[PDB]
Coordinates of C-alpha atoms and ligand atoms in Angstrom, one line a residue:
X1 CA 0.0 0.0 0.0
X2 CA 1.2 3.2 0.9
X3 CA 2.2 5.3 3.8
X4 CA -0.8 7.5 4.8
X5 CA -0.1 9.3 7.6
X6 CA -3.1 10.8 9.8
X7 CA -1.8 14.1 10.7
X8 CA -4.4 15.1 12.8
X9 CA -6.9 13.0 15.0
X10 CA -10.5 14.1 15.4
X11 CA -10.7 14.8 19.2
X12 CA -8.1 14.2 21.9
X13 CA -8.3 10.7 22.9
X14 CA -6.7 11.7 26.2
X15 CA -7.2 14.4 28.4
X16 CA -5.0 15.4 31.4
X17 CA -5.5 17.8 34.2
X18 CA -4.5 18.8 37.7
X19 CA -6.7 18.6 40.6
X20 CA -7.3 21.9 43.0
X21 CA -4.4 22.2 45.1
X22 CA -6.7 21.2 48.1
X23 CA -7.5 18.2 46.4
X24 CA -4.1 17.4 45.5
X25 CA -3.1 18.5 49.5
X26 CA -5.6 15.6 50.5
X27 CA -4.0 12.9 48.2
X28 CA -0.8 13.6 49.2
X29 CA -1.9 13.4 53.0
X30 CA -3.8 10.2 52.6
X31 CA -1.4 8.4 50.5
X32 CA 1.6 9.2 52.3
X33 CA 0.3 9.2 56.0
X34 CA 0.4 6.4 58.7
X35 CA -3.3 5.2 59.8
X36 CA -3.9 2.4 62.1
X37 CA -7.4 1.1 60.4
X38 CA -6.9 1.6 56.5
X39 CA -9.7 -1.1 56.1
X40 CA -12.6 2.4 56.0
X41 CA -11.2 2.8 52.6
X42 CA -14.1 -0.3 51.3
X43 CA -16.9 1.6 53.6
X44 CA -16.1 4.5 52.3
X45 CA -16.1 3.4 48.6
X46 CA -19.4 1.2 49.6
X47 CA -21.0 4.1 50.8
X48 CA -20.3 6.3 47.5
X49 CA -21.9 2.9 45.7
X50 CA -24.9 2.9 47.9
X51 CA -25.5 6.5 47.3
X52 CA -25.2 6.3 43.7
X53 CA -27.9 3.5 43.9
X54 CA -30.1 5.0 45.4
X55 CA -30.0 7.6 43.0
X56 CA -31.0 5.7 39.8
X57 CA -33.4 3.6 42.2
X58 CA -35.2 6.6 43.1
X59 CA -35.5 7.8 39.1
X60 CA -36.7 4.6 38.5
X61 CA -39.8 5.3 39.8
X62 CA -40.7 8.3 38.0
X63 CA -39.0 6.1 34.6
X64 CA -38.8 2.5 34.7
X65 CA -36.7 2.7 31.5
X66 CA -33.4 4.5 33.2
X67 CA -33.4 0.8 34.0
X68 CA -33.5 -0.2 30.1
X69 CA -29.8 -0.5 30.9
X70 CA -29.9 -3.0 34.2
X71 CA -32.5 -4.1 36.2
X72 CA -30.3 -5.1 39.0
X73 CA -29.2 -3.0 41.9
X74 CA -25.7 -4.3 43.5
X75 CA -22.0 -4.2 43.8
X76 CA -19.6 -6.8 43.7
X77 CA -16.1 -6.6 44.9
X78 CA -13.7 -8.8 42.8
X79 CA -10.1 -9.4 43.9
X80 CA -7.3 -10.0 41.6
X81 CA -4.1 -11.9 43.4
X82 CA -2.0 -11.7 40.4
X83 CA -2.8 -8.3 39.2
X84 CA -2.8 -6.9 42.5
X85 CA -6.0 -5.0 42.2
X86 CA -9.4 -4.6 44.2
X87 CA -12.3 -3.7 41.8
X88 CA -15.4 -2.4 43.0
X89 CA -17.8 -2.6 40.5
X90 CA -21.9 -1.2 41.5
X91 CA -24.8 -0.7 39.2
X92 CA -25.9 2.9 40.3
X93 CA -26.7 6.0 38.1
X94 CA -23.0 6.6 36.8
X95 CA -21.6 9.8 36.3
X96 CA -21.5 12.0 33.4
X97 CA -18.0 13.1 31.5
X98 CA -18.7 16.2 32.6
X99 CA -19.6 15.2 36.5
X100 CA -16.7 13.1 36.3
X101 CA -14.1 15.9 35.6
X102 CA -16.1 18.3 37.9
X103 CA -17.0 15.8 41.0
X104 CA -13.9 14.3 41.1
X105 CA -10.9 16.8 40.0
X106 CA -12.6 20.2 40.8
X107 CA -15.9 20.7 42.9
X108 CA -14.5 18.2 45.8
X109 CA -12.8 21.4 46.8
X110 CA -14.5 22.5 49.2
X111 CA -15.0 19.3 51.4
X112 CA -10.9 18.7 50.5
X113 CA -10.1 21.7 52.2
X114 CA -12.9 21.2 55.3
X115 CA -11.6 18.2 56.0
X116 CA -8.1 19.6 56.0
X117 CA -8.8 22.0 58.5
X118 CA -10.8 19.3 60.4
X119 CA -7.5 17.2 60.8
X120 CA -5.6 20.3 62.0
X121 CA -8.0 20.7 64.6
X122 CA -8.2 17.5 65.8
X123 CA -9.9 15.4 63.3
X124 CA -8.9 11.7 62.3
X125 CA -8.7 9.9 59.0
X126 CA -12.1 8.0 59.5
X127 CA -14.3 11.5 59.4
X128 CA -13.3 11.6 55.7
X129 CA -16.9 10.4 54.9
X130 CA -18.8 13.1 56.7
X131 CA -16.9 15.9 54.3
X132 CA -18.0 14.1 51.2
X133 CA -14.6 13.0 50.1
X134 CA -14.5 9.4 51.0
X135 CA -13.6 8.4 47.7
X136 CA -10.1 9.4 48.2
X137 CA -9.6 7.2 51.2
X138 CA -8.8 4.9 48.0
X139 CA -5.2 5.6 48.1
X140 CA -4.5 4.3 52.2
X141 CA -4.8 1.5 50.2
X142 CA -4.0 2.3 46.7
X143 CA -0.8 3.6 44.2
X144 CA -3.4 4.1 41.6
X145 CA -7.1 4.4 41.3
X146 CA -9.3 3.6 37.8
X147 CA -12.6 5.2 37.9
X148 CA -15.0 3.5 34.9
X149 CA -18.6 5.3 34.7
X150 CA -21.6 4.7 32.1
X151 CA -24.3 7.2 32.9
X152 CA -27.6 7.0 30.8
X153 CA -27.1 10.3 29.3
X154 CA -23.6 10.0 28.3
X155 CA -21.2 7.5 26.8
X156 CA -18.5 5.4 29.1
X157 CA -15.4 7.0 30.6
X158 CA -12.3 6.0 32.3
X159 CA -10.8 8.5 34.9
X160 CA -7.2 7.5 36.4
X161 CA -4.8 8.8 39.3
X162 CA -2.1 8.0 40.7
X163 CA -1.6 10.9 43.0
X164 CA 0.9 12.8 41.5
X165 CA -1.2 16.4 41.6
X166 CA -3.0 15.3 37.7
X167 CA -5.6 12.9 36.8
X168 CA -6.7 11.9 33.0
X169 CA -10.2 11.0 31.4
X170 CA -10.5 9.0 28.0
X171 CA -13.4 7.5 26.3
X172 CA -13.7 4.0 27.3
X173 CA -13.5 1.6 24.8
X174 CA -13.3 -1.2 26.9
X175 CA -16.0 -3.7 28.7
X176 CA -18.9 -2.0 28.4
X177 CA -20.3 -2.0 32.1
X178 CA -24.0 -0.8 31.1
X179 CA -24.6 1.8 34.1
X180 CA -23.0 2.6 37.0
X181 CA -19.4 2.9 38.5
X182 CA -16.2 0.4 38.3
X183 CA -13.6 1.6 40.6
X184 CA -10.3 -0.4 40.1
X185 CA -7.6 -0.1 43.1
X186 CA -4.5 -1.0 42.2
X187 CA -2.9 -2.1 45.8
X188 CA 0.4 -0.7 47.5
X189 CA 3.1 -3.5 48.0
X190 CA 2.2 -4.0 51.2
X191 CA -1.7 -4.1 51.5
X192 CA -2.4 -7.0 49.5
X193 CA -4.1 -8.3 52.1
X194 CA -7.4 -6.9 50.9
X195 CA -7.2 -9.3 47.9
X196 CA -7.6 -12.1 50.4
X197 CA -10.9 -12.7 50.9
X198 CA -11.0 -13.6 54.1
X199 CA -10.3 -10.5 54.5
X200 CA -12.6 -8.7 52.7
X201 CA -15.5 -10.6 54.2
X202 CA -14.6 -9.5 57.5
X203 CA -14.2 -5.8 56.6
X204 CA -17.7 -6.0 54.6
X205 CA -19.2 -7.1 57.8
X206 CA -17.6 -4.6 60.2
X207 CA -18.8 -1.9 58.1
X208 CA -21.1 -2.4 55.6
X209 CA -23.7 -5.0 57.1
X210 CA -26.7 -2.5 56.9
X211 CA -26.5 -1.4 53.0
X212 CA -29.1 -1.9 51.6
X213 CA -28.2 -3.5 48.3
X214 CA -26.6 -7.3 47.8
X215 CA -22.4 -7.2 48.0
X216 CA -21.2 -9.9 46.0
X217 CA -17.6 -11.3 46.1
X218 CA -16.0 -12.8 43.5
X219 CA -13.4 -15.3 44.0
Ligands
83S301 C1 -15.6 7.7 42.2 C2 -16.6 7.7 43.5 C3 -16.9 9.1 43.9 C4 -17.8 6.9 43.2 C5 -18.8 7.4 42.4 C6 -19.9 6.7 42.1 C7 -21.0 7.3 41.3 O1 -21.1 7.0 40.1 N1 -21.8 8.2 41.9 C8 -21.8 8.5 43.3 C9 -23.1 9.2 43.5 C10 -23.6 9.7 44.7 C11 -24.9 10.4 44.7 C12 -25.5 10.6 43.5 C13 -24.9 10.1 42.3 C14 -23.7 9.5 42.3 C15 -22.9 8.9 41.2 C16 -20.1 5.3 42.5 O2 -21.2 4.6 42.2 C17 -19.1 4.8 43.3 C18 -17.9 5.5 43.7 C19 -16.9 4.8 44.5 O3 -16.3 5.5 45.5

Protein backbone atom coordinates (compact mmCIF):
# COMPACT_ATOMS: atom_id res chain seq x y z
CA UNK A 1 0.00 0.00 0.00
CA UNK A 2 1.22 3.16 0.86
CA UNK A 3 2.22 5.29 3.75
CA UNK A 4 -0.78 7.46 4.77
CA UNK A 5 -0.12 9.30 7.63
CA UNK A 6 -3.12 10.84 9.77
CA UNK A 7 -1.78 14.09 10.73
CA UNK A 8 -4.36 15.05 12.84
CA UNK A 9 -6.94 13.04 15.02
CA UNK A 10 -10.48 14.11 15.41
CA UNK A 11 -10.70 14.76 19.18
CA UNK A 12 -8.08 14.21 21.86
CA UNK A 13 -8.28 10.73 22.88
CA UNK A 14 -6.72 11.75 26.20
CA UNK A 15 -7.20 14.43 28.37
CA UNK A 16 -4.98 15.36 31.39
CA UNK A 17 -5.45 17.83 34.20
CA UNK A 18 -4.49 18.81 37.69
CA UNK A 19 -6.66 18.57 40.60
CA UNK A 20 -7.31 21.89 42.96
CA UNK A 21 -4.45 22.19 45.11
CA UNK A 22 -6.74 21.20 48.14
CA UNK A 23 -7.46 18.21 46.41
CA UNK A 24 -4.11 17.45 45.51
CA UNK A 25 -3.08 18.46 49.47
CA UNK A 26 -5.65 15.61 50.51
CA UNK A 27 -4.04 12.94 48.18
CA UNK A 28 -0.79 13.62 49.15
CA UNK A 29 -1.87 13.40 53.02
CA UNK A 30 -3.80 10.22 52.55
CA UNK A 31 -1.38 8.43 50.49
CA UNK A 32 1.60 9.23 52.34
CA UNK A 33 0.25 9.22 56.05
CA UNK A 34 0.36 6.36 58.72
CA UNK A 35 -3.28 5.21 59.79
CA UNK A 36 -3.86 2.37 62.06
CA UNK A 37 -7.45 1.06 60.40
CA UNK A 38 -6.94 1.65 56.53
CA UNK A 39 -9.73 -1.13 56.11
CA UNK A 40 -12.63 2.39 56.03
CA UNK A 41 -11.25 2.79 52.60
CA UNK A 42 -14.09 -0.26 51.29
CA UNK A 43 -16.85 1.65 53.56
CA UNK A 44 -16.11 4.53 52.31
CA UNK A 45 -16.12 3.35 48.57
CA UNK A 46 -19.45 1.20 49.60
CA UNK A 47 -21.03 4.13 50.78
CA UNK A 48 -20.28 6.27 47.55
CA UNK A 49 -21.89 2.92 45.69
CA UNK A 50 -24.91 2.91 47.89
CA UNK A 51 -25.50 6.54 47.29
CA UNK A 52 -25.20 6.32 43.69
CA UNK A 53 -27.93 3.46 43.89
CA UNK A 54 -30.11 4.98 45.37
CA UNK A 55 -30.00 7.62 43.04
CA UNK A 56 -31.01 5.75 39.83
CA UNK A 57 -33.37 3.58 42.15
CA UNK A 58 -35.18 6.62 43.09
CA UNK A 59 -35.47 7.76 39.13
CA UNK A 60 -36.75 4.63 38.50
CA UNK A 61 -39.78 5.29 39.77
CA UNK A 62 -40.72 8.28 37.96
CA UNK A 63 -38.97 6.09 34.60
CA UNK A 64 -38.76 2.55 34.70
CA UNK A 65 -36.73 2.71 31.52
CA UNK A 66 -33.43 4.52 33.23
CA UNK A 67 -33.41 0.76 34.02
CA UNK A 68 -33.53 -0.20 30.07
CA UNK A 69 -29.80 -0.47 30.87
CA UNK A 70 -29.86 -3.03 34.17
CA UNK A 71 -32.55 -4.09 36.22
CA UNK A 72 -30.28 -5.09 38.97
CA UNK A 73 -29.21 -3.00 41.90
CA UNK A 74 -25.71 -4.32 43.53
CA UNK A 75 -21.98 -4.19 43.83
CA UNK A 76 -19.57 -6.81 43.65
CA UNK A 77 -16.12 -6.63 44.86
CA UNK A 78 -13.66 -8.80 42.79
CA UNK A 79 -10.12 -9.36 43.91
CA UNK A 80 -7.26 -9.98 41.64
CA UNK A 81 -4.10 -11.92 43.36
CA UNK A 82 -1.99 -11.67 40.39
CA UNK A 83 -2.78 -8.33 39.24
CA UNK A 84 -2.82 -6.93 42.47
CA UNK A 85 -6.02 -4.99 42.25
CA UNK A 86 -9.36 -4.57 44.24
CA UNK A 87 -12.32 -3.65 41.84
CA UNK A 88 -15.39 -2.43 43.03
CA UNK A 89 -17.81 -2.58 40.47
CA UNK A 90 -21.91 -1.23 41.55
CA UNK A 91 -24.80 -0.71 39.17
CA UNK A 92 -25.92 2.89 40.26
CA UNK A 93 -26.71 6.04 38.09
CA UNK A 94 -22.95 6.63 36.78
CA UNK A 95 -21.62 9.78 36.26
CA UNK A 96 -21.51 12.00 33.41
CA UNK A 97 -17.97 13.06 31.53
CA UNK A 98 -18.67 16.17 32.61
CA UNK A 99 -19.61 15.25 36.52
CA UNK A 100 -16.74 13.06 36.26
CA UNK A 101 -14.09 15.85 35.59
CA UNK A 102 -16.13 18.33 37.85
CA UNK A 103 -17.00 15.77 41.00
CA UNK A 104 -13.90 14.25 41.12
CA UNK A 105 -10.85 16.80 40.04
CA UNK A 106 -12.65 20.20 40.83
CA UNK A 107 -15.88 20.73 42.89
CA UNK A 108 -14.48 18.23 45.77
CA UNK A 109 -12.78 21.36 46.80
CA UNK A 110 -14.46 22.52 49.20
CA UNK A 111 -15.03 19.34 51.39
CA UNK A 112 -10.94 18.66 50.46
CA UNK A 113 -10.12 21.74 52.16
CA UNK A 114 -12.91 21.23 55.30
CA UNK A 115 -11.63 18.16 56.02
CA UNK A 116 -8.11 19.56 55.99
CA UNK A 117 -8.79 22.04 58.50
CA UNK A 118 -10.76 19.27 60.43
CA UNK A 119 -7.53 17.21 60.76
CA UNK A 120 -5.57 20.33 61.95
CA UNK A 121 -7.99 20.74 64.59
CA UNK A 122 -8.22 17.49 65.83
CA UNK A 123 -9.92 15.39 63.31
CA UNK A 124 -8.89 11.68 62.31
CA UNK A 125 -8.74 9.85 58.97
CA UNK A 126 -12.06 8.01 59.55
CA UNK A 127 -14.32 11.47 59.45
CA UNK A 128 -13.30 11.59 55.65
CA UNK A 129 -16.87 10.41 54.91
CA UNK A 130 -18.80 13.11 56.72
CA UNK A 131 -16.95 15.95 54.28
CA UNK A 132 -18.03 14.05 51.16
CA UNK A 133 -14.58 12.98 50.06
CA UNK A 134 -14.45 9.40 51.01
CA UNK A 135 -13.56 8.42 47.70
CA UNK A 136 -10.05 9.37 48.24
CA UNK A 137 -9.64 7.16 51.23
CA UNK A 138 -8.85 4.86 48.02
CA UNK A 139 -5.22 5.59 48.15
CA UNK A 140 -4.47 4.30 52.17
CA UNK A 141 -4.77 1.52 50.23
CA UNK A 142 -4.01 2.34 46.70
CA UNK A 143 -0.84 3.59 44.23
CA UNK A 144 -3.45 4.09 41.63
CA UNK A 145 -7.12 4.38 41.30
CA UNK A 146 -9.33 3.64 37.84
CA UNK A 147 -12.55 5.17 37.92
CA UNK A 148 -14.96 3.48 34.90
CA UNK A 149 -18.56 5.29 34.69
CA UNK A 150 -21.59 4.75 32.13
CA UNK A 151 -24.28 7.22 32.93
CA UNK A 152 -27.65 6.97 30.79
CA UNK A 153 -27.07 10.31 29.29
CA UNK A 154 -23.55 9.99 28.25
CA UNK A 155 -21.21 7.51 26.79
CA UNK A 156 -18.54 5.42 29.11
CA UNK A 157 -15.39 7.01 30.55
CA UNK A 158 -12.30 6.04 32.32
CA UNK A 159 -10.84 8.51 34.93
CA UNK A 160 -7.17 7.47 36.37
CA UNK A 161 -4.79 8.81 39.28
CA UNK A 162 -2.14 7.97 40.71
CA UNK A 163 -1.61 10.94 42.95
CA UNK A 164 0.86 12.82 41.54
CA UNK A 165 -1.24 16.36 41.56
CA UNK A 166 -2.96 15.28 37.71
CA UNK A 167 -5.61 12.89 36.78
CA UNK A 168 -6.66 11.90 33.03
CA UNK A 169 -10.17 11.04 31.39
CA UNK A 170 -10.45 9.03 28.03
CA UNK A 171 -13.44 7.51 26.30
CA UNK A 172 -13.66 4.00 27.27
CA UNK A 173 -13.49 1.62 24.81
CA UNK A 174 -13.31 -1.25 26.95
CA UNK A 175 -16.03 -3.71 28.73
CA UNK A 176 -18.92 -1.96 28.43
CA UNK A 177 -20.35 -1.97 32.10
CA UNK A 178 -24.03 -0.79 31.13
CA UNK A 179 -24.64 1.80 34.07
CA UNK A 180 -23.02 2.59 37.05
CA UNK A 181 -19.44 2.88 38.49
CA UNK A 182 -16.24 0.41 38.25
CA UNK A 183 -13.58 1.62 40.56
CA UNK A 184 -10.26 -0.39 40.13
CA UNK A 185 -7.64 -0.13 43.07
CA UNK A 186 -4.53 -1.00 42.23
CA UNK A 187 -2.93 -2.11 45.78
CA UNK A 188 0.42 -0.74 47.51
CA UNK A 189 3.12 -3.48 47.95
CA UNK A 190 2.23 -3.97 51.25
CA UNK A 191 -1.69 -4.07 51.46
CA UNK A 192 -2.44 -7.01 49.53
CA UNK A 193 -4.10 -8.30 52.09
CA UNK A 194 -7.40 -6.93 50.91
CA UNK A 195 -7.24 -9.32 47.89
CA UNK A 196 -7.58 -12.13 50.37
CA UNK A 197 -10.94 -12.67 50.92
CA UNK A 198 -11.03 -13.60 54.15
CA UNK A 199 -10.27 -10.49 54.53
CA UNK A 200 -12.58 -8.68 52.68
CA UNK A 201 -15.48 -10.55 54.24
CA UNK A 202 -14.63 -9.47 57.48
CA UNK A 203 -14.17 -5.77 56.57
CA UNK A 204 -17.73 -5.97 54.62
CA UNK A 205 -19.15 -7.09 57.83
CA UNK A 206 -17.59 -4.62 60.17
CA UNK A 207 -18.76 -1.89 58.09
CA UNK A 208 -21.05 -2.38 55.62
CA UNK A 209 -23.72 -5.00 57.14
CA UNK A 210 -26.68 -2.50 56.94
CA UNK A 211 -26.48 -1.37 53.05
CA UNK A 212 -29.11 -1.86 51.57
CA UNK A 213 -28.16 -3.49 48.32
CA UNK A 214 -26.56 -7.34 47.83
CA UNK A 215 -22.41 -7.24 48.04
CA UNK A 216 -21.24 -9.95 46.01
CA UNK A 217 -17.63 -11.27 46.08
CA UNK A 218 -15.98 -12.76 43.54
CA UNK A 219 -13.38 -15.31 44.03
C1 LIG B 1 -15.58 7.68 42.22
C2 LIG B 1 -16.55 7.70 43.52
C3 LIG B 1 -16.90 9.07 43.94
C4 LIG B 1 -17.79 6.86 43.23
C5 LIG B 1 -18.77 7.42 42.44
C6 LIG B 1 -19.93 6.65 42.11
C7 LIG B 1 -21.01 7.27 41.27
O1 LIG B 1 -21.14 6.99 40.05
N1 LIG B 1 -21.81 8.22 41.86
C8 LIG B 1 -21.81 8.51 43.28
C9 LIG B 1 -23.08 9.25 43.55
C10 LIG B 1 -23.63 9.72 44.71
C11 LIG B 1 -24.85 10.41 44.68
C12 LIG B 1 -25.49 10.62 43.48
C13 LIG B 1 -24.92 10.14 42.27
C14 LIG B 1 -23.73 9.47 42.31
C15 LIG B 1 -22.90 8.88 41.22
C16 LIG B 1 -20.08 5.32 42.55
O2 LIG B 1 -21.18 4.60 42.17
C17 LIG B 1 -19.08 4.76 43.33
C18 LIG B 1 -17.93 5.50 43.67
C19 LIG B 1 -16.87 4.82 44.53
O3 LIG B 1 -16.35 5.45 45.50
Amino acid sequence: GHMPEEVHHGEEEVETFAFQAEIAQLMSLIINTFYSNKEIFLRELISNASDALDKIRYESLTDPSKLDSGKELKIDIIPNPQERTLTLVDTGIGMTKADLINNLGTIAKSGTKAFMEALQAGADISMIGQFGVGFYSAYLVAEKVVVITKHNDDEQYAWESSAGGSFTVRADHGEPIGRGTKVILHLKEDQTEYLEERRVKEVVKKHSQFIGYPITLYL
